[PDB]
């Protein structure tokens, strides 16, 4: 009933930042 | 009963800045 | 009831961050 | 009673980061 | 090179339509 | 190289329309 | 090389209209 | 060379329609 | 050299449809 | 050496269907 | 040289289709 | 060297398509 | 009645990490 | 009667990272 | 009345990782 | 009694990690 969805991403660029690929394709469908 | 959805991206800055590739397609429908 | 969906990724760069691939293709149908 | 899923991924790049693949293809369906 | 991804669903009602659940949780992730 | 995605949905309510539940979570990250 | 994404819902009306439940979460992200 | 995916679902409801569930959980990575 | 994956489902009701559940859980992970 | 998967499922309900479950669970790694 | 995986199931009802459960679980690994 | 794997299952009932549970578990490691 | 499925994978490389291929093709099906 | 499903992957590097191929292709159909 | 499904794999490299072929084709229907 | 499945595998290398072949074909079938 209580949808508790928590997405936490940690990126500690202590050396040299760049660019990682993160795709959040979290999709939920329910009959109305 | 609420939909408590939390999305957090913690990016640390210590080196040469650039840019991440994040795509948010999180969706829901009832 | 609570639908506890916790997704957590820890990426720690201590040398030279580049870019990994994290594809969260998590879905549901009712 | 209810779904309780938790995905925890640890990536400690102490040397030199690169690019690993993490495919989370989780899909569940139910008839209402 | 063409990535041909065809998704076709044919629902034909001749009596009394209601509501079927079709969930396309198709995704992909690639290193760049 | 040339992404050709064709999503064609056919719904011919010749009797009595209502409400089908279609969920499209098609997403790709590169 | 273009992303030709075609999405179409053909709903025929011959009975009593109501309303479908469609969730369009189609997307994507690449290095730009 | 390239990917060729074809998903064709036929649902001919001559009588009374209801609610069938089609779960397309397809995920590929590289 | 093309990955040809075709999935076809033929559901034909001539009396009274209900709730057939089909789950297509297909995935794959690679590195080339 | 490209994978050629073809799945064909025929469901002919001359009387009336209730609830059948077809599970396709296929995964490969390279 | 290719891989031909053809899965075909025939389900014909002439009175009352209750519904069966057909689970197709196939997996393959390889280093290329 | 082409691999041919074709699974054909028949299930026709002229009375009551009860149905049972069939498990096709096939795994190949290279 | 209370499903407790847990997958724990350890990848400790203290030299030159390459990356193993882990295919978690876990599927489940049941008639409702 | 809770469905407790936890997946934990511990990837530790102390020299040089590369690219692991982790595929969590899990699916359930009811 | 708990269903215990514990899968644990330990991979430790003290020289030079290469990457094993770990395929967990776990299929379970009821 | 309630299903108790436990799969433990150890892969240690102190010289040069290799691509060990591990295939777990688990097949579970039971009536509901």
Short mmCIF file of C-alpha atoms in Angstrom, two decimals:
data_model
loop_
_atom_site.label_atom_id
_atom_site.label_comp_id
_atom_site.label_asym_id
_atom_site.label_seq_id
_atom_site.Cartn_x
_atom_site.Cartn_y
_atom_site.Cartn_z
CA UNK A 1 0.00 0.00 0.00
CA UNK A 2 2.75 2.40 1.03
CA UNK A 3 5.24 2.30 -1.83
CA UNK A 4 8.64 3.03 -0.32
CA UNK A 5 11.12 3.25 -3.16
CA UNK A 6 14.46 4.82 -2.31
CA UNK A 7 17.26 4.97 -4.85
CA UNK A 8 20.55 6.19 -3.40
CA UNK A 9 23.64 6.51 -5.57
CA UNK A 10 27.03 7.35 -4.09
CA UNK A 11 29.86 8.61 -6.27
CA UNK A 12 32.98 9.70 -4.41
CA UNK A 13 35.21 11.21 -7.08
CA UNK A 14 38.26 11.64 -4.85
CA UNK A 15 40.68 11.20 -7.73
CA UNK A 16 39.29 12.65 -10.93
CA UNK A 17 35.62 13.06 -11.85
CA UNK A 18 34.36 11.74 -15.16
CA UNK A 19 30.99 10.31 -16.14
CA UNK A 20 29.28 7.03 -15.35
CA UNK A 21 26.08 5.89 -17.05
CA UNK A 22 23.07 5.30 -14.82
CA UNK A 23 19.70 4.42 -16.28
CA UNK A 24 16.68 4.39 -14.03
CA UNK A 25 14.05 2.52 -16.02
CA UNK A 26 11.96 1.64 -12.99
CA UNK A 27 8.40 1.54 -14.27
CA UNK A 28 5.34 0.11 -12.58
CA UNK A 29 1.86 -0.15 -14.05
CA UNK A 30 -1.37 -1.29 -12.38
CA UNK A 31 -4.94 -1.72 -13.69
CA UNK A 32 -7.15 1.21 -12.71
CA UNK B 1 -0.58 5.29 2.38
CA UNK B 2 1.56 7.59 0.25
CA UNK B 3 4.14 6.75 -2.41
CA UNK B 4 7.39 7.82 -0.76
CA UNK B 5 9.86 7.77 -3.63
CA UNK B 6 13.29 9.27 -3.02
CA UNK B 7 16.05 9.56 -5.61
CA UNK B 8 19.43 10.95 -4.56
CA UNK B 9 22.76 11.21 -6.37
CA UNK B 10 25.70 12.06 -4.10
CA UNK B 11 28.60 13.19 -6.25
CA UNK B 12 31.85 14.05 -4.52
CA UNK B 13 34.19 16.72 -5.87
CA UNK B 14 37.91 16.19 -5.32
CA UNK B 15 39.33 15.86 -8.82
CA UNK B 16 38.71 17.38 -12.25
CA UNK B 17 34.97 17.98 -12.76
CA UNK B 18 33.22 16.44 -15.76
CA UNK B 19 29.66 15.11 -15.84
CA UNK B 20 27.76 11.88 -15.27
CA UNK B 21 25.20 10.32 -17.61
CA UNK B 22 22.00 9.79 -15.64
CA UNK B 23 18.60 9.00 -17.09
CA UNK B 24 15.50 9.12 -14.93
CA UNK B 25 12.59 7.21 -16.47
CA UNK B 26 11.09 6.22 -13.13
CA UNK B 27 7.33 6.25 -13.52
CA UNK B 28 4.21 4.65 -12.15
CA UNK B 29 0.51 4.69 -12.93
CA UNK B 30 -2.42 3.00 -11.20
CA UNK C 1 1.87 -2.92 4.11
CA UNK C 2 5.02 -1.15 2.92
CA UNK C 3 6.67 -2.05 -0.38
CA UNK C 4 10.28 -1.57 0.66
CA UNK C 5 12.29 -1.22 -2.52
CA UNK C 6 15.78 -0.04 -1.61
CA UNK C 7 18.33 0.36 -4.37
CA UNK C 8 21.74 1.62 -3.30
CA UNK C 9 25.04 1.71 -5.18
CA UNK C 10 28.33 2.76 -3.61
CA UNK C 11 31.02 3.91 -6.05
CA UNK C 12 34.20 5.12 -4.36
CA UNK C 13 36.95 6.63 -6.51
CA UNK C 14 40.35 7.02 -4.89
CA UNK C 15 42.36 7.01 -8.10
CA UNK C 16 40.67 8.10 -11.31
CA UNK C 17 36.90 7.75 -11.81
CA UNK C 18 35.79 6.89 -15.33
CA UNK C 19 32.29 5.55 -15.83
CA UNK C 20 30.59 2.24 -15.16
CA UNK C 21 27.18 1.16 -16.47
CA UNK C 22 24.28 0.82 -14.06
CA UNK C 23 21.08 -0.19 -15.80
CA UNK C 24 18.15 -0.43 -13.44
CA UNK C 25 15.53 -1.98 -15.70
CA UNK C 26 13.35 -2.95 -12.76
CA UNK C 27 9.68 -3.10 -13.62
CA UNK C 28 6.38 -4.43 -12.40
CA UNK C 29 2.94 -5.15 -13.79
CA UNK C 30 -0.36 -5.79 -12.02
CA UNK D 1 1.94 -9.74 2.72
CA UNK D 2 4.31 -7.34 0.96
CA UNK D 3 7.45 -7.20 -1.20
CA UNK D 4 10.77 -6.36 0.44
CA UNK D 5 13.59 -6.23 -2.09
CA UNK D 6 16.96 -4.61 -1.52
CA UNK D 7 19.83 -4.30 -3.97
CA UNK D 8 23.14 -3.19 -2.47
CA UNK D 9 26.20 -2.94 -4.69
CA UNK D 10 29.62 -2.04 -3.34
CA UNK D 11 32.29 -0.72 -5.69
CA UNK D 12 35.55 0.34 -4.06
CA UNK D 13 37.90 1.61 -6.75
CA UNK D 14 41.16 2.18 -4.88
CA UNK D 15 43.38 1.98 -7.94
CA UNK D 16 41.84 3.29 -11.15
CA UNK D 17 38.16 3.21 -12.04
CA UNK D 18 37.00 2.05 -15.46
CA UNK D 19 33.58 0.75 -16.51
CA UNK D 20 31.82 -2.37 -15.28
CA UNK D 21 28.37 -3.52 -16.35
CA UNK D 22 25.62 -3.85 -13.75
CA UNK D 23 22.38 -4.98 -15.35
CA UNK D 24 19.41 -5.01 -13.00
CA UNK D 25 16.76 -6.67 -15.14
CA UNK D 26 14.21 -7.43 -12.46
CA UNK D 27 10.63 -7.87 -13.60
CA UNK D 28 7.61 -9.18 -11.79
CA UNK D 29 4.03 -9.41 -13.01
CA UNK D 30 0.75 -10.44 -11.34
CA UNK D 31 -2.86 -10.74 -12.52
CA UNK D 32 -5.26 -8.50 -10.59
CA UNK E 1 23.00 -0.86 -39.08
CA UNK E 2 19.34 -0.44 -38.12
CA UNK E 3 18.16 -1.61 -34.72
CA UNK E 4 14.75 -2.92 -35.71
CA UNK E 5 12.59 -3.17 -32.61
CA UNK E 6 8.95 -3.74 -33.49
CA UNK E 7 6.35 -4.17 -30.77
CA UNK E 8 2.78 -4.70 -31.97
CA UNK E 9 -0.23 -5.70 -29.91
CA UNK E 10 -3.61 -6.39 -31.50
CA UNK E 11 -6.65 -6.28 -29.22
CA UNK E 12 -9.94 -6.83 -31.01
CA UNK E 13 -13.19 -6.48 -29.05
CA UNK E 14 -16.34 -7.89 -30.60
CA UNK E 15 -18.36 -8.18 -27.40
CA UNK E 16 -17.38 -6.12 -24.36
CA UNK E 17 -13.85 -4.80 -23.78
CA UNK E 18 -12.56 -4.39 -20.23
CA UNK E 19 -8.86 -3.94 -19.53
CA UNK E 20 -5.92 -6.27 -20.04
CA UNK E 21 -2.50 -5.46 -18.60
CA UNK E 22 0.38 -5.26 -21.04
CA UNK E 23 3.66 -4.23 -19.46
CA UNK E 24 6.67 -3.67 -21.66
CA UNK E 25 9.60 -3.53 -19.25
CA UNK E 26 12.16 -3.66 -22.03
CA UNK E 27 15.46 -1.96 -21.31
CA UNK E 28 19.16 -1.98 -22.01
CA UNK E 29 22.46 -0.58 -20.79
CA UNK E 30 25.80 -0.25 -22.62
CA UNK E 31 29.28 1.04 -21.75
CA UNK E 32 30.20 4.32 -23.44
CA UNK F 1 23.21 2.94 -35.34
CA UNK F 2 19.74 3.84 -36.59
CA UNK F 3 17.33 2.98 -33.78
CA UNK F 4 14.01 2.04 -35.35
CA UNK F 5 11.46 1.36 -32.63
CA UNK F 6 7.87 0.89 -33.73
CA UNK F 7 5.27 0.53 -31.00
CA UNK F 8 1.88 0.04 -32.61
CA UNK F 9 -1.08 -0.82 -30.41
CA UNK F 10 -4.40 -1.81 -31.92
CA UNK F 11 -7.60 -1.73 -29.90
CA UNK F 12 -10.90 -2.00 -31.75
CA UNK F 13 -13.71 -1.74 -29.23
CA UNK F 14 -16.50 -2.87 -31.55
CA UNK F 15 -18.61 -3.91 -28.59
CA UNK F 16 -18.11 -1.61 -25.64
CA UNK F 17 -15.02 0.45 -24.88
CA UNK F 18 -13.49 0.41 -21.41
CA UNK F 19 -9.86 0.80 -20.41
CA UNK F 20 -6.90 -1.44 -21.14
CA UNK F 21 -3.81 -1.01 -18.99
CA UNK F 22 -0.66 -0.55 -21.07
CA UNK F 23 2.70 0.17 -19.47
CA UNK F 24 5.67 1.19 -21.58
CA UNK F 25 8.89 1.21 -19.56
CA UNK F 26 11.10 0.86 -22.62
CA UNK F 27 14.30 2.72 -21.85
CA UNK F 28 17.90 2.34 -22.90
CA UNK F 29 21.02 3.96 -21.50
CA UNK F 30 24.37 4.09 -23.30
CA UNK G 1 21.52 7.56 -38.05
CA UNK G 2 18.54 9.00 -36.18
CA UNK G 3 16.45 7.50 -33.39
CA UNK G 4 13.15 6.98 -35.20
CA UNK G 5 10.79 6.07 -32.39
CA UNK G 6 7.18 5.65 -33.43
CA UNK G 7 4.47 5.11 -30.83
CA UNK G 8 0.77 5.00 -31.69
CA UNK G 9 -2.39 3.72 -30.01
CA UNK G 10 -5.27 2.98 -32.38
CA UNK G 11 -8.47 3.00 -30.33
CA UNK G 12 -11.68 2.25 -32.21
CA UNK G 13 -14.95 3.57 -30.81
CA UNK G 14 -18.05 1.50 -31.56
CA UNK G 15 -19.50 1.00 -28.08
CA UNK G 16 -19.61 3.00 -24.87
CA UNK G 17 -16.49 5.17 -24.49
CA UNK G 18 -14.54 5.21 -21.22
CA UNK G 19 -10.77 5.60 -21.13
CA UNK G 20 -7.67 3.42 -21.23
CA UNK G 21 -4.81 3.47 -18.73
CA UNK G 22 -1.56 4.00 -20.61
CA UNK G 23 1.77 4.72 -18.95
CA UNK G 24 4.41 6.09 -21.29
CA UNK G 25 7.81 5.89 -19.58
CA UNK G 26 9.72 5.32 -22.81
CA UNK G 27 13.03 7.15 -22.88
CA UNK G 28 16.78 6.86 -22.88
CA UNK G 29 20.08 8.66 -22.39
CA UNK G 30 23.41 8.61 -24.23
CA UNK G 31 26.68 10.53 -23.93
CA UNK G 32 26.05 14.07 -25.16
CA UNK H 1 25.81 -6.45 -37.28
CA UNK H 2 22.57 -5.37 -35.61
CA UNK H 3 19.63 -6.46 -33.46
CA UNK H 4 16.23 -7.47 -34.83
CA UNK H 5 13.50 -7.83 -32.22
CA UNK H 6 9.89 -8.55 -33.14
CA UNK H 7 7.10 -8.92 -30.60
CA UNK H 8 3.68 -9.64 -32.07
CA UNK H 9 0.79 -10.39 -29.74
CA UNK H 10 -2.65 -11.23 -31.08
CA UNK H 11 -5.67 -10.91 -28.81
CA UNK H 12 -8.93 -11.65 -30.59
CA UNK H 13 -11.80 -11.28 -28.14
CA UNK H 14 -14.92 -12.47 -29.96
CA UNK H 15 -16.84 -12.89 -26.72
CA UNK H 16 -16.47 -10.97 -23.49
CA UNK H 17 -13.12 -9.29 -22.84
CA UNK H 18 -11.54 -9.23 -19.40
CA UNK H 19 -7.93 -8.71 -18.40
CA UNK H 20 -5.03 -10.91 -19.44
CA UNK H 21 -1.54 -10.02 -18.24
CA UNK H 22 1.40 -9.81 -20.61
CA UNK H 23 4.74 -9.17 -18.95
CA UNK H 24 7.54 -8.23 -21.33
CA UNK H 25 10.61 -8.27 -19.10
CA UNK H 26 13.42 -8.05 -21.65
CA UNK H 27 16.79 -6.63 -20.69
CA UNK H 28 20.09 -6.76 -22.52
CA UNK H 29 23.43 -5.18 -21.63
CA UNK H 30 26.85 -4.61 -23.20
CA UNK I 1 25.15 -11.43 -38.45
CA UNK I 2 21.93 -10.21 -36.88
CA UNK I 3 20.28 -11.29 -33.64
CA UNK I 4 16.81 -12.32 -34.80
CA UNK I 5 14.52 -12.75 -31.82
CA UNK I 6 10.81 -12.99 -32.57
CA UNK I 7 8.12 -13.82 -30.04
CA UNK I 8 4.57 -14.33 -31.26
CA UNK I 9 1.57 -15.17 -29.10
CA UNK I 10 -1.78 -15.97 -30.70
CA UNK I 11 -4.67 -15.69 -28.25
CA UNK I 12 -8.07 -16.24 -29.84
CA UNK I 13 -11.21 -16.23 -27.70
CA UNK I 14 -14.54 -17.16 -29.23
CA UNK I 15 -16.55 -17.34 -26.02
CA UNK I 16 -15.34 -15.51 -22.92
CA UNK I 17 -11.83 -14.23 -22.25
CA UNK I 18 -10.48 -13.98 -18.72
CA UNK I 19 -6.94 -13.57 -17.44
CA UNK I 20 -4.13 -15.51 -19.05
CA UNK I 21 -0.74 -14.58 -17.68
CA UNK I 22 2.33 -14.72 -19.89
CA UNK I 23 5.73 -13.79 -18.52
CA UNK I 24 8.59 -13.10 -20.88
CA UNK I 25 11.65 -12.92 -18.64
CA UNK I 26 14.53 -12.80 -21.09
CA UNK I 27 17.85 -11.14 -20.38
CA UNK I 28 21.52 -11.24 -21.22
CA UNK I 29 24.76 -9.60 -20.15
CA UNK I 30 27.98 -9.45 -22.20
CA UNK I 31 31.26 -7.65 -22.80
CA UNK I 32 33.07 -7.57 -26.14
CA UNK J 1 26.83 -17.22 -35.10
CA UNK J 2 24.01 -14.82 -34.25
CA UNK J 3 21.24 -16.07 -31.97
CA UNK J 4 17.97 -16.79 -33.76
CA UNK J 5 15.25 -17.37 -31.19
CA UNK J 6 11.68 -17.85 -32.36
CA UNK J 7 8.89 -18.45 -29.86
CA UNK J 8 5.42 -19.26 -31.15
CA UNK J 9 2.54 -19.86 -28.76
CA UNK J 10 -0.96 -20.75 -29.95
CA UNK J 11 -3.95 -20.28 -27.65
CA UNK J 12 -7.32 -21.12 -29.17
CA UNK J 13 -10.19 -20.78 -26.71
CA UNK J 14 -13.30 -22.11 -28.46
CA UNK J 15 -15.18 -22.25 -25.17
CA UNK J 16 -13.72 -19.88 -22.60
CA UNK J 17 -10.35 -19.34 -20.95
CA UNK J 18 -9.70 -18.83 -17.25
CA UNK J 19 -6.09 -18.28 -16.25
CA UNK J 20 -3.14 -20.03 -17.86
CA UNK J 21 0.46 -19.19 -17.02
CA UNK J 22 3.20 -19.33 -19.62
CA UNK J 23 6.60 -18.64 -18.14
CA UNK J 24 9.53 -17.85 -20.39
CA UNK J 25 12.72 -17.58 -18.36
CA UNK J 26 15.81 -17.40 -20.56
CA UNK J 27 19.13 -15.80 -19.74
CA UNK J 28 22.53 -15.89 -21.37
CA UNK J 29 25.97 -14.52 -20.59
CA UNK J 30 29.00 -13.90 -22.81
CA UNK K 1 26.96 -21.30 -37.29
CA UNK K 2 23.94 -19.53 -35.80
CA UNK K 3 21.75 -20.77 -32.96
CA UNK K 4 18.21 -21.86 -33.82
CA UNK K 5 16.00 -21.88 -30.74
CA UNK K 6 12.39 -22.51 -31.71
CA UNK K 7 9.83 -22.93 -28.96
CA UNK K 8 6.30 -23.73 -30.12
CA UNK K 9 3.37 -24.68 -27.91
CA UNK K 10 -0.15 -25.52 -29.05
CA UNK K 11 -3.03 -25.00 -26.63
CA UNK K 12 -6.49 -25.61 -28.05
CA UNK K 13 -9.65 -25.52 -25.95
CA UNK K 14 -13.02 -26.75 -27.16
CA UNK K 15 -15.07 -26.30 -23.99
CA UNK K 16 -13.37 -24.82 -20.93
CA UNK K 17 -9.73 -23.75 -20.68
CA UNK K 18 -8.77 -23.77 -17.00
CA UNK K 19 -5.14 -22.95 -17.60
CA UNK K 20 -1.87 -24.83 -17.28
CA UNK K 21 1.63 -23.74 -16.31
CA UNK K 22 4.41 -24.20 -18.81
CA UNK K 23 7.77 -23.05 -17.58
CA UNK K 24 10.56 -22.69 -20.09
CA UNK K 25 13.80 -22.05 -18.23
CA UNK K 26 16.91 -22.09 -20.39
CA UNK K 27 20.31 -20.62 -19.67
CA UNK K 28 23.61 -20.40 -21.50
CA UNK K 29 27.11 -19.19 -20.69
CA UNK K 30 30.18 -18.76 -22.91
CA UNK K 31 33.49 -16.89 -23.07
CA UNK K 32 33.99 -15.16 -26.42
CA UNK L 1 27.94 -26.08 -36.57
CA UNK L 2 24.50 -24.51 -36.32
CA UNK L 3 22.61 -25.56 -33.20
CA UNK L 4 19.03 -26.68 -33.71
CA UNK L 5 16.80 -26.71 -30.65
CA UNK L 6 13.09 -26.95 -31.40
CA UNK L 7 10.58 -27.77 -28.68
CA UNK L 8 7.07 -28.67 -29.82
CA UNK L 9 4.32 -29.37 -27.30
CA UNK L 10 0.73 -30.34 -28.07
CA UNK L 11 -2.23 -29.79 -25.74
CA UNK L 12 -5.77 -30.04 -27.09
CA UNK L 13 -8.81 -30.86 -24.96
CA UNK L 14 -12.35 -31.17 -26.27
CA UNK L 15 -13.83 -31.10 -22.78
CA UNK L 16 -11.97 -29.36 -19.99
CA UNK L 17 -8.48 -27.97 -20.60
CA UNK L 18 -7.38 -28.43 -17.01
CA UNK L 19 -3.68 -28.24 -17.66
CA UNK L 20 -0.70 -29.25 -15.57
CA UNK L 21 2.78 -28.00 -14.75
CA UNK L 22 5.54 -28.65 -17.29
CA UNK L 23 9.11 -27.61 -16.55
CA UNK L 24 11.60 -27.24 -19.37
CA UNK L 25 14.94 -26.67 -17.65
CA UNK L 26 17.77 -26.71 -20.18
CA UNK L 27 21.18 -25.24 -19.43
CA UNK L 28 24.30 -25.13 -21.56
CA UNK L 29 27.72 -23.94 -20.45
CA UNK L 30 30.54 -23.19 -22.89
CA UNK M 1 4.96 -18.81 2.83
CA UNK M 2 7.68 -16.30 3.69
CA UNK M 3 10.09 -16.17 0.76
CA UNK M 4 13.69 -15.51 1.76
CA UNK M 5 15.84 -15.34 -1.35
CA UNK M 6 19.27 -13.81 -0.93
CA UNK M 7 22.20 -13.74 -3.33
CA UNK M 8 25.60 -12.76 -1.98
CA UNK M 9 28.53 -12.46 -4.36
CA UNK M 10 32.06 -11.57 -3.32
CA UNK M 11 34.55 -10.11 -5.79
CA UNK M 12 37.71 -9.18 -3.92
CA UNK M 13 40.56 -8.36 -6.28
CA UNK M 14 43.73 -7.05 -4.69
CA UNK M 15 45.76 -7.01 -7.89
CA UNK M 16 44.36 -6.29 -11.33
CA UNK M 17 40.57 -6.44 -11.48
CA UNK M 18 39.10 -7.62 -14.77
CA UNK M 19 35.56 -8.61 -13.94
CA UNK M 20 33.75 -11.93 -13.89
CA UNK M 21 30.52 -12.67 -15.72
CA UNK M 22 27.68 -13.53 -13.40
CA UNK M 23 24.36 -14.39 -14.96
CA UNK M 24 21.58 -14.53 -12.40
CA UNK M 25 18.89 -16.08 -14.58
CA UNK M 26 16.49 -16.84 -11.73
CA UNK M 27 12.87 -17.20 -12.75
CA UNK M 28 9.66 -18.24 -11.06
CA UNK M 29 6.13 -18.92 -12.30
CA UNK M 30 2.80 -19.96 -10.75
CA UNK M 31 -0.88 -20.12 -11.72
CA UNK M 32 -3.05 -17.62 -9.86
CA UNK N 1 4.48 -13.51 4.70
CA UNK N 2 6.89 -10.93 3.34
CA UNK N 3 9.00 -11.57 0.26
CA UNK N 4 12.49 -10.77 1.51
CA UNK N 5 14.79 -10.65 -1.50
CA UNK N 6 18.22 -9.15 -1.01
CA UNK N 7 21.05 -9.11 -3.51
CA UNK N 8 24.45 -7.90 -2.37
CA UNK N 9 27.54 -7.68 -4.55
CA UNK N 10 30.89 -6.73 -3.05
CA UNK N 11 33.39 -5.50 -5.65
CA UNK N 12 36.67 -4.42 -4.10
CA UNK N 13 39.66 -3.11 -6.03
CA UNK N 14 43.13 -2.26 -4.75
CA UNK N 15 45.01 -2.05 -8.04
CA UNK N 16 43.07 -1.33 -11.23
CA UNK N 17 39.40 -1.68 -12.15
CA UNK N 18 38.09 -2.86 -15.51
CA UNK N 19 34.63 -4.15 -16.38
CA UNK N 20 32.68 -6.93 -14.69
CA UNK N 21 29.55 -8.34 -16.32
CA UNK N 22 26.89 -8.66 -13.64
CA UNK N 23 23.44 -9.56 -14.88
CA UNK N 24 20.56 -9.81 -12.46
CA UNK N 25 17.97 -11.10 -14.91
CA UNK N 26 15.44 -12.30 -12.36
CA UNK N 27 11.74 -12.47 -13.09
CA UNK N 28 8.57 -13.68 -11.49
CA UNK N 29 5.11 -14.27 -12.92
CA UNK N 30 1.92 -14.97 -10.98
CA UNK O 1 7.21 -21.55 7.03
CA UNK O 2 10.09 -19.84 5.25
CA UNK O 3 11.55 -20.60 1.84
CA UNK O 4 15.31 -20.38 2.22
CA UNK O 5 17.05 -19.54 -1.03
CA UNK O 6 20.65 -18.66 -0.21
CA UNK O 7 23.14 -18.46 -3.06
CA UNK O 8 26.68 -17.46 -2.13
CA UNK O 9 29.72 -17.31 -4.39
CA UNK O 10 33.15 -16.22 -3.21
CA UNK O 11 35.75 -14.99 -5.70
CA UNK O 12 39.08 -13.82 -4.31
CA UNK O 13 42.02 -12.72 -6.47
CA UNK O 14 45.40 -11.92 -4.98
CA UNK O 15 47.21 -11.54 -8.29
CA UNK O 16 45.34 -10.72 -11.50
CA UNK O 17 41.59 -11.10 -11.97
CA UNK O 18 40.29 -12.55 -15.22
CA UNK O 19 36.63 -13.24 -14.61
CA UNK O 20 34.87 -16.57 -14.36
CA UNK O 21 31.76 -17.76 -16.19
CA UNK O 22 29.16 -17.95 -13.43
CA UNK O 23 25.79 -18.95 -14.79
CA UNK O 24 22.94 -19.37 -12.34
CA UNK O 25 20.07 -20.65 -14.46
CA UNK O 26 17.64 -21.22 -11.61
CA UNK O 27 14.17 -22.04 -12.83
CA UNK O 28 11.31 -22.81 -10.50
CA UNK O 29 7.64 -23.12 -11.37
CA UNK O 30 4.58 -24.23 -9.41
CA UNK P 1 9.02 -29.04 5.27
CA UNK P 2 9.72 -25.57 3.90
CA UNK P 3 12.25 -25.50 1.06
CA UNK P 4 15.82 -24.88 2.17
CA UNK P 5 18.15 -24.33 -0.77
CA UNK P 6 21.78 -23.46 -0.12
CA UNK P 7 24.45 -23.13 -2.80
CA UNK P 8 27.96 -22.26 -1.62
CA UNK P 9 30.90 -22.03 -4.02
CA UNK P 10 34.47 -20.90 -3.34
CA UNK P 11 36.83 -19.64 -6.03
CA UNK P 12 40.14 -18.42 -4.65
CA UNK P 13 43.30 -17.66 -6.59
CA UNK P 14 46.63 -16.39 -5.29
CA UNK P 15 48.41 -16.29 -8.62
CA UNK P 16 46.25 -15.52 -11.62
CA UNK P 17 42.44 -15.54 -11.50
CA UNK P 18 40.94 -17.61 -14.30
CA UNK P 19 37.60 -17.86 -16.06
CA UNK P 20 36.24 -20.88 -14.22
CA UNK P 21 33.15 -22.43 -15.79
CA UNK P 22 30.24 -22.70 -13.34
CA UNK P 23 26.78 -23.70 -14.51
CA UNK P 24 23.99 -24.14 -11.98
CA UNK P 25 20.99 -25.68 -13.73
CA UNK P 26 18.35 -25.63 -11.01
CA UNK P 27 15.00 -27.12 -11.94
CA UNK P 28 12.14 -26.94 -9.49
CA UNK P 29 8.63 -28.13 -10.30
CA UNK P 30 5.70 -28.72 -7.94
CA UNK P 31 1.90 -28.67 -8.01
CA UNK P 32 0.01 -25.83 -6.32
#
